[PDB]
């Protein structure tokens, strides 16, 4: 049956597959969107939505009961942006390899943990900020945000130092939204230096 479409020899594999995919878009646009690309809903990155399933300044207090998924859904929020990828993206990319998401491991909920999200309704400026008990009194320990436009800094803080003054480890990640499946990849240049 498939032999009635095998006709053009040495057609590049890009040109075959794109030819079918574009052929569907052509047809799907004409039926359901009336030949108007403006009516196609835009997202930041397309991918990583398992097939099973607007507040500015929020605060989430984990208990020893809190379900992990309820917890991570809440941090990511509704909009699809870096924060969504940071907390739901199952793993991230180091060079070519696929390591478990570290951002998810750090924020894995347990009693005492307190997240604060500031500027949650403008991704540009959003700052999630984990706080834990450190010698009784409760202090900042982790800080997610954007520096440059496609870098996620996850400042991991130590409060128990030599001279009381706290010390930061800037773990940097690239956010490339054209790789929908794994849009977060660790910056591995000077990681060991840092």
């Amino acid at each position: 049956v498939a032999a009635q479409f095998t006709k053009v020899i040495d057609e590049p594999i890009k040109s075959i597959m794109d030819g079918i995919h574009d052929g569907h878009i052509k047809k799907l646009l004409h039926q359901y969107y009336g030949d108007d690309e403006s009516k196609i809903p835009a997202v930041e990155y397309f991918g990583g939505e398992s097939p099973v399933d607007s507040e500015d300044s929020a605060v989430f207090k984990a208990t020893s009961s809190t379900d992990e998924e309820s917890w991570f859904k809440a941090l990511a929020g509704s909009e699809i942006n870096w924060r969504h990828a940071s907390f739901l993206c199952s793993f991230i990319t180091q060079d070519k390899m696929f390591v478990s998401n570290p951002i998810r491991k750090v924020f894995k909920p347990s009693q005492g943990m307190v997240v604060e999200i500031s500027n949650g309704n403008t991704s540009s400026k959003t700052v999630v900020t984990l706080s834990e008990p450190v010698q009784g009194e409760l202090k900042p320990t982790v800080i997610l945000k954007l520096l440059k436009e496609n870098i996620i800094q996850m400042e991991m803080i130590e409060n128990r130092t030599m001279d009381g003054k706290p010390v930061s480890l800037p773990l940097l990640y690239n956010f490339n939204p054209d790789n929908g499946f794994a849009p977060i990849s660790e910056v591995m240049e000077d990681r060991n230096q840092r």
Binding site: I25, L28, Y32, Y33, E37, P41, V43, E44, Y45, F46
Partner: peptide, 15 residues
């Protein structure tokens, strides 16, 4: 229902 969707880069997908 099959749907269309875009990226930030304006690449159209069949959703």
């Amino acid at each position: 229902h099959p749907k269309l969707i875009k990226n930030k880069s304006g690449k159209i997908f069949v959703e």
